[PDB]
Design a protein around this ligand. Structure first.
Ligand SMILES: O=C(O)[C@H](O)c1cccc(Cl)c1
Length: 330
């Protein structure tokens, strides 16, 4: 089997991407944030504290003839940005882009943090990291991908995120029309439960490529590109007036700037992030200070190849017995 679903930026900055997901019988379609950096499929629901729902589409398990309470199971998750959610668990039929998984754990939110409430466009998350990170207790649950894997034509999914435009998540096949040149594959460590790999280095604009190992994770659920402070300083040093602001929470730059590109290495291959991709707009409405799309990972504890990097590539998440990642230009 295969599945293919369009993923759409939630706003004009590509702050996140939502992908329609069918849950239950008859189908309830929710727009979920596909997140290769976490491993819980959770949704706003009929159980979510009413004051914490503001415009989201909710899953109502009582209206699904295939919903079953997973007795005793609870979940609770905190994300890298400080947000969190928690609740109980159903199993139900879940379909993504024509690919159907029966008995998928659908984690129903009883509580969500303010940032989730305030984002009316995201109805929940669909985790695509390794199931070892799944937070369901006392019985850990599998991701949608892990459940689907054995049925897929090939044990892979691909992320093809658009810049200010829709893109695609495919499951079970590699669309050879969706990228240019060849796909370069690189080793993955699953030891922290992430799609963790090692970039071979970077270049800033038309500068010389610096060969250096940068361990980080391919994370569709993170908006920006977070890299070591040395790397990020070298990038922003090429932008007149750019500076790190403790009050704003990272590098800012004059909105009048033309940003240089940023290249990262994947083995001997190179993925080029156009400068425009690195512009996240005024720090506040009407401001002439703009927020940078490349930020320091110092303090996070891990480097993160988030949407800013991933949207510049066609990315293969290969979930074979020995997982690997693939990157192609597009
Ligand atoms: O808004 C301003 O003051 C200018 O755009 C400016 C000048 C220098 C540095 C920044 Cl981040 C912004």
């Amino acid at each position: 089997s295969t599945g293919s679903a369009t993923t759409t930026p939630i706003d004009s900055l590509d702050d996140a991407y939502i992908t329609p997901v069918q849950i239950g019988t008859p189908a309830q379609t929710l727009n979920l944030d596909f997140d290769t950096g976490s491993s819980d499929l959770w949704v706003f629901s009929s159980e979510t504290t009413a004051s914490e729902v503001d415009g989201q589409t909710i899953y109502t398990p009582s209206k699904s003839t295939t919903a079953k309470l997973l007795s005793g199971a609870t979940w609770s998750i905190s994300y890298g940005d400080g947000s969190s959610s928690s609740g109980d668990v159903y199993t139900d039929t879940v379909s993504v882009g024509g690919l159907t998984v029966t008995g998928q754990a659908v984690e129903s939110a009883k509580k969500v943090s303010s940032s989730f409430t305030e984002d009316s466009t995201i109805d929940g998350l669909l985790g695509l990291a390794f199931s070892t990170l799944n937070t369901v207790s006392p019985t850990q649950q599998k991701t949608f991908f892990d459940n689907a894997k054995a049925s897929l034509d090939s044990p892979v999914f691909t992320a093809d995120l658009g810049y200010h435009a829709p893109g695609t998540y495919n499951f079970g096949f590699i669309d050879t029309t969706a990228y240019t040149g060849s796909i370069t594959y690189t080793a993955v460590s699953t030891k922290q439960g992430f799609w963790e790999w090692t970039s071979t280095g970077y270049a800033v604009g038309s500068g010389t490529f610096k060969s250096t190992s940068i361990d980080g994770i391919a994370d569709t659920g993170t908006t920006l590109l977070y890299l070591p402070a040395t790397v990020v300083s070298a990038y922003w040093a090429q932008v007149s007036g750019a500076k790190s602001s403790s009050s704003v929470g990272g590098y800012v730059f004059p909105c009048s700037a033309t940003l240089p590109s940023f290249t990262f290495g994947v083995g001997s291959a190179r993925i080029v992030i156009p400068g425009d991709y690195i512009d996240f707009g005024p720090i506040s409405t009407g401001s002439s200070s703009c927020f940078g799309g490349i930020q320091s990972s110092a303090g996070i504890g891990i480097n993160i190849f988030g949407d800013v990097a991933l949207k510049a590539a066609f990315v293969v998440f290969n979930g074979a017995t020995t997982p690997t990642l693939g990157f192609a230009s597009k």
